[PDB]
Amino acid sequence: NYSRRVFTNCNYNLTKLLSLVEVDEFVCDKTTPESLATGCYSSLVVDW
Amino acid sequence: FALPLSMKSTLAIGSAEAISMFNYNQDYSNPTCRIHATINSNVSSSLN
Numbered sequence: 001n002y003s004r005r006v007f008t009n010c011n012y013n014l015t016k017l018l019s020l021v022e023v024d025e026f027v028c029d030k031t032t033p034e035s036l037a038t039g040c041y042s043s044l045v046v047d048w
Numbered sequence: 049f050a051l052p053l054s055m056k057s058t059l060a061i062g063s064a065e066a067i068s069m070f071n072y073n074q075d076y077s078n079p080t081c082r083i084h085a086t087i088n089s090n091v092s093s094s095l096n
């Protein structure tokens with residue numbers, strides 16, 4: 001039972017998530033974590 | 049240099065963390081091999 005959030009019409013500070021955790025592995029396709037914090041999106045779906 | 053294996057994903061290609069943006073940015077224009085080695089205390093006592 002996991003939860004999903006969709007963020008639209010707001011400015012995100014993805015550093016807040018990454019400076020609070022330590023990353024053990026990232027798997028990306030068509031993007032990178034360096035470019036996930038700089039690009040502009042239509043929506044941002046987060047499942048955790 | 050010295051770095052733990054818990055941060056082995058911090059040196060990976062594309063990351064928004066402090067190592068790959070302040071400490072070590074790797075040049076991928078040439079043939080490279082990043083070896084995450086480990087030296088135990090028995091070997092690292094005669095060669096000091």
Ligand SMILES: *[C@@H]1O[C@H](CO)[C@@H](O[C@@H]2O[C@H](CO)[C@@H](O)[C@H](O)[C@H]2NC(C)=O)[C@H](O)[C@H]1NC(C)=O
Nearest residue numbers: 001002003004005006007008044045046047048
């Ligand atoms: C399964 O997860 C959902 C959401 O992740 C939980 O639903 C929330 O439940 C709380 C309290 O019951 C409510 O205040 C929220 O509004 C609910 N959110 C949504 C989106 O429905 C649900 O409780 C979880 N199930 C169990 C058994 O823990």
Ligand SMILES: *[C@@H]1O[C@H](CO)[C@@H](O)[C@H](O)[C@H]1NC(C)=O
Nearest residue numbers: 087088089090091092093094
């Ligand atoms: C190092 O070698 C000795 C034998 O001289 C051995 O007893 C010891 O267990 C070795 N160290 C490790 C970490 O295995």
Ligand SMILES: *[C@@H]1O[C@H](CO)[C@@H](O)[C@H](O)[C@H]1NC(C)=O
Nearest residue numbers: 089090091092093094095096
């Ligand atoms: C380091 O270890 C070597 C072992 O051959 C020894 O000769 C040397 O004196 C050591 N260096 C020190 C204690 O500063």
